[PDB]
Amino acid sequence: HHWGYGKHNGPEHWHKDFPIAKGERQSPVDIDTHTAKYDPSLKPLSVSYDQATSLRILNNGHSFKVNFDDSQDKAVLKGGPLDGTYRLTQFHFHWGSLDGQGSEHTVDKKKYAAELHLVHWNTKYGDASKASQQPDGLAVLGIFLKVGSAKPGLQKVVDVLDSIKTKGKSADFTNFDPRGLLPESLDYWTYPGSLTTPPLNETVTWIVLKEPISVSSEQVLKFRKLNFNGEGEPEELMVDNWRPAQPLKNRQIKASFK
Ligand SMILES: N=C(N)NC(=N)NCc1ccc(S(N)(=O)=O)cc1
Ligand SMILES: [Zn+2]
Numbered sequence: 081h082h083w084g085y086g087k088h089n090g091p092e093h094w095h096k097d098f099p100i101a102k103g104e105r106q107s108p109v110d111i112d113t114h115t116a117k118y119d120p121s122l123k124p125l126s127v128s129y130d131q132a133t134s135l136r137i138l139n140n141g142h143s144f145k146v147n148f149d150d151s152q153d154k155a156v157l158k159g160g161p162l163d164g165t166y167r168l169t170q171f172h173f174h175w176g177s178l179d180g181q182g183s184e185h186t187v188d189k190k191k192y193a194a195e196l197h198l199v200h201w202n203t204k205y206g207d208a209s210k211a212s213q214q215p216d217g218l219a220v221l222g223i224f225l226k227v228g229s230a231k232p233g234l235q236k237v238v239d240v241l242d243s244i245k246t247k248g249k250s251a252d253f254t255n256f257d258p259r260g261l262l263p264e265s266l267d268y269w270t271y272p273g274s275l276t277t278p279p280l281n282e283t284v285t286w287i288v289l290k291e292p293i294s295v296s297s298e299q300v301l302k303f304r305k306l307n308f309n310g311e312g313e314p315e316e317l318m319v320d321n322w323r324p325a326q327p328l329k330n331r332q333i334k335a336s337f338k
Contacts, residue, residue, distance in 0.1 A: 083278045084142070084308065091323050098280045105282040106326035107273030108184035108222075111333055116269055119334040125160035125266045125287065127221070127259075132168060134256040137240055141247035141308055142277060143321055145172040146237070146256060150201070150208065155258070157200045157219055160336065161270040161285055166200035166219040169208050171258060173197070174276075175303045177319040179227045182300075184276050184322045185288050187224075192292055193300055194225035195322070196261055197276075217283045218275075223263065224292035231295045233260020238302040247310040263291035267337040276323045290337065 083089055083097065095101035132155035135147045147170050148155060155168035175194035176182025183192035198221040201211035211217035225231075236256055243251045267290040274282045306318035 085321050094278055094280065098278045100274070100280050100282060103274065103280070103282055104329050105272055105274055105331065106280065107276050107284060107286060108186070108323060108325055109271065109273065109328050109331075109333070110186045110189060110325040111269050111288065113188050113335075116333040116335045118338050119336070122161060122270070122334060122336045123159040125268060125336070126156075126158040127262065127266065128158070129155045129168065129257070129259045131155060132256075132258055134253050134258075136250050137237070137244060137253035138250040139244040139247055139306060139318075141310070143172040143174065143318075144241065144244060144306060145170050146253055146258075153203065157198075157221060157287075160268065160287055161334070162219055163216070165203045167203055168198060168200050168258070171196060171198045171261070173225075173303065174322040175225070175300060175319065176322065177304065177317075179297070179300065181320065182322055183224055184325075185222055185224070185286075186325055192224040193227050194295070194303065196223040196225065196293075197221070198223070198258065198261075212275075212281055212283055214283055215272075216285065219285045219287060222286060222288040223261065224289070225295050225300070226292045227297050227300055228294040229296065230299060231261070231293050233257070234293075234295055234299055238299050241302050241306060245305070245311075246307045246313075249311070261293065263289055263293050265289070265291040267291065267335075269333050269335055271331050271333040273331075
């Protein structure tokens with residue numbers, strides 16, 4: 081009875097096996113744009129992805145994920161609210177059954193069709209496992225997806241999805257450039273939070289970009305053809321793999337922009 085997104089194993093059940101689900105620093109959250117405070121002390125974010133080395137793409141039964149070579153400082157996130165250097169290790173997405181839902185974060189209660197998470201770890205802790213347990217160990221760059229014009233830099237991803245339809249399947253996925261997934265503006269909101277799946281560790285500095293990327297209907301429809309189930313199990317489409325907004329509690333969301 082492993083965690084998932086169904087009626088019997090979804091977000092409202094997670095606290096039983098991961099009690100921090102009811103913690104003080106859980107993610108995602110609703111971003112109230114009129115309560116978020118502009119912080120003139122914040123730096124421009126530095127997203128340095130030119131030397132990224134993608135390795136493989138996997139369906140893990142909860143999303144699909146592209147792993148990167150993080151054995152040296154190839155693709156890093158710096159600046160903004162961060163102190164030190166954060167190495168890109170993986171990206172994945174959350175998405176909906178319909179275009180009107182799918183994001184984890186919301187903006188003035190608005191849901192987007194999907195949300196991209198670029199996951200980074202603080203190099204001062206040496207490896208991602210150790211970093212994941214530290215209060216300033218991880219930084220997730222979150223990017224909203226809306227449906228409209230196609231995103232050309234996403235097409236290589238959606239064309240490989242037919243090869244990883246079911247849980248446990250992986251494929252080679254070298255030479256993918258994550259710069260092709262970024263919007264024009266790096267304006268962002270930031271707040272201290274958590275992983276949005278089990279184990280829900282409260283170890284993430286969230287950086288959520290204000291500007292969504294557009295993807296086509298055809299692109300997001302291909303996400304929805306993935307399966308939660310393994311090969312030779314009854315088919316259950318991988319859709320609505322998002323955690324709802326959690327209580328903000330004693331946190332302030334800061335804006336990088338006026
Ligand atoms: N359940 C796991 N395999 N997850 C794990 N340890 N990966 C850690 C992990 C990384 C990022 C995110 S997210 N959605 O906040 O960006 C969730 C979980
Ligand atoms: Zn995520």
